[PDB]
Amino acid sequence: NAMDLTILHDCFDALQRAPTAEAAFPPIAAAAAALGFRYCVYGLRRTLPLARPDMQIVGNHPREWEHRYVKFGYVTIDPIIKRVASQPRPVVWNAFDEPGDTAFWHDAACFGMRYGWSHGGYDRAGNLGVLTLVRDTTPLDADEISRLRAPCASLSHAAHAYLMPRLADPIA
Amino acid sequence: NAMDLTILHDCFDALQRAPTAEAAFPPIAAAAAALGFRYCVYGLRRTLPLARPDMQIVGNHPREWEHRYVKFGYVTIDPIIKRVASQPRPVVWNAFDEPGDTAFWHDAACFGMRYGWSHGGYDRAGNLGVLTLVRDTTPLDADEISRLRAPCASLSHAAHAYLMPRLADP
């Protein structure tokens, strides 16, 4: 378990030499993978579109999941977004065990988006950035959640501090 | 080094059963102390007061430093707030090497708040919470900063997610 702290040490050093969102994501995804999360997704939802919320999505998620996330208009009714946008704490979810939003969780479960850890963060301009860590094999028991809080918190701060600002305002 | 993960593990366990700010701050401050930071200060700056910004300050700082901070209106000129608000990355400062703001840095260095680590986060309402971890001993070199990033990131997340909400509304 001491290996977990090395995982984050190597991530944050790589994030010091990542001046773009293209260079900043692989460190965060590699750390999440080392923590047991097969999938690592980041979404930037901007406040200025007002008429229609726009969701910018980067991640190693299945392409067909995002394709259906787009064609079915899931940004309008995304249950994870509604839960992380209202509260500051991380949201642990299970696609087989969530109430309502039947169509959303149906597609998520069909493509491995099954057992997730999601945390939302805000920037100076009011944009919402959501880091989502998903595994496709087993939901975490509470004892594994307890030990993963600090590492996931670390990754969550890293995504909001090193990835989100370089998605919102690229150097070029 | 094996401790840093257990230092934070114990902190995050305590914050699960911490429904008040009186109960959320000590575990964070305890972790900051175990990481080498004697002073742990959290400030919540409001956007609403407009003409000048209100700021709640909670921490184990020397209290007479807080009294100067209010006496000379430092909330309007605070160099650290200025830098953690315009940028989402942490800020590492040295009260003897920071340019300008001579009066501000003189007062901070007077009460041992000399070599600090500060990070600012926002909430849905647009408020600014700032976690500041300070030493009175030695400056922060490039080597210790590297290994302190991941643990201090967890502390930032912990402060913004568990302490900031309790100051803002409960």
Automatic annotation (TrEMBL), chain B:
<dbReference type="GO" id="GO:0006355">
    <property type="term" value="P:regulation of DNA-templated transcription"/>
</dbReference>
<keyword id="KW-0238">DNA-binding</keyword>
<keyword id="KW-0804">Transcription</keyword>
<dbReference type="GO" id="GO:0003677">
    <property type="term" value="F:DNA binding"/>
</dbReference>
<keyword id="KW-0805">Transcription regulation</keyword>
<protein>
    <submittedName>
        <fullName>N-acylhomoserine lactone dependent regulatory protein</fullName>
    </submittedName>
</protein>
